[model samples]
Target: NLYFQGYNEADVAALVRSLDRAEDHHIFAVDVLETYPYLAESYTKVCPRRCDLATAAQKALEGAYSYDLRLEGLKADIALMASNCVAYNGPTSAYAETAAKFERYALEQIDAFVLEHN
Candidate 1:
């Protein structure tokens, strides 16, 4: 940890902690959440989403792909929200709930955007 004389380790630790928390959501609305916390979306398992939307959203949300050298690919993403595996890794019941929560947040964001613009 080489740094200038006044570089505080506590400040560096706190910065790393914040960056660690932010990695949970890689991007998309995550950028919105970062810059506009007040305008960010939130949802709960209550009033949970059912129907194919869950199936559809879950399928899409899970298994983030990578194109790095050696073609290593297909890492998990959705289970981070659900706190369990999904897709082929898991047939988790919480799978759909994750999708519902994500969609609710997304819809709320768009709704806010619409009302703000209109």
Candidate 2:
């Protein structure tokens, strides 16, 4: 079974711990995958994450936030997708099909990582 959840930390200590874990995990994953060309290819092909990050970081720092100012936050800094929504929305598929492919790719990467490391 797979389980992923963000720990609840309305407080400083909890937030710190969560941030530590999140950054550690994500950093490791990103560092390991940075050498690969697959993520960049996929993003440019479909997801808008890459373009979103660039724009969010520089150009579109405008009123991205909603009602509560707290909603305004920096880019995820995780593996991004989408080269540019306007340029390319990537592959066209139903939600289930695309998400299933994502799961497959994720498992493939994770398995490769474990096999190589362990």
Candidate 3:
């Protein structure tokens, strides 16, 4: 319709950018709601229609949060390997194992999330 109406490439590109930002903000808001589920419920009390999105967003957020929490321990363990306070007694091969596990888990979770949304 815009093309038929004489909107040029630059104008169409600008409109696309605006839409991209709008979608980005929606995802960002969903992440924030996941970070604070209570906030979503509080709003839903006054705006009932938002409840559905809130519930789904919270579920996705929780999944990501769970993965993040699991990574925390692995991250600390990796860090400890380098810190002077803890002597690195483990085999040199152990470092690669831990790092590999972390990377694999991270990639798997990210792929899962992308696939879920896709």
Q: Pick by lDDT: which candidate is best?
A: 3
Model 2, range 1-102, lDDT digits (tens) per residue? 134222122321221122222312222222222544566766544543442222332322333321212221322221232113223433463433433343
lDDT of 3 by residue, 1-118 (tens): 2232221333222222222123223321223345567666654454333221233234333342233323343233223322211122233555444434433543454345434533
Which parts of model 1 are misplaced by more than 4 Å? 1-92
For candidate 1, what is the lDDT? 0.30
Q: Ten consecutive residues with minimal summed lDDT in candidate 2? A: 7-16
| TM-score order of candidates, top first | 1, 3, 2
The TM-score between candidate 2 and the true structure equals: 0.24
Q: lDDT score of model 2?
A: 0.31
Q: Each candidate: how many clashes?
A: 0, 6, 0
Clashing pairs in 3: none
Instruction: Report lDDT (Cα) of residue 103, candidate 2.
Output: 35
Q: What is the TM-score of each candidate against the true structure?
A: 0.26, 0.24, 0.24
Overall lDDT per candidate, in order of appearance? 0.30, 0.31, 0.34
lDDT of 1 at 32: 28
Better of 2 and 3 by lDDT: 3
Give the winner by TM-score: 1 or 3: 1
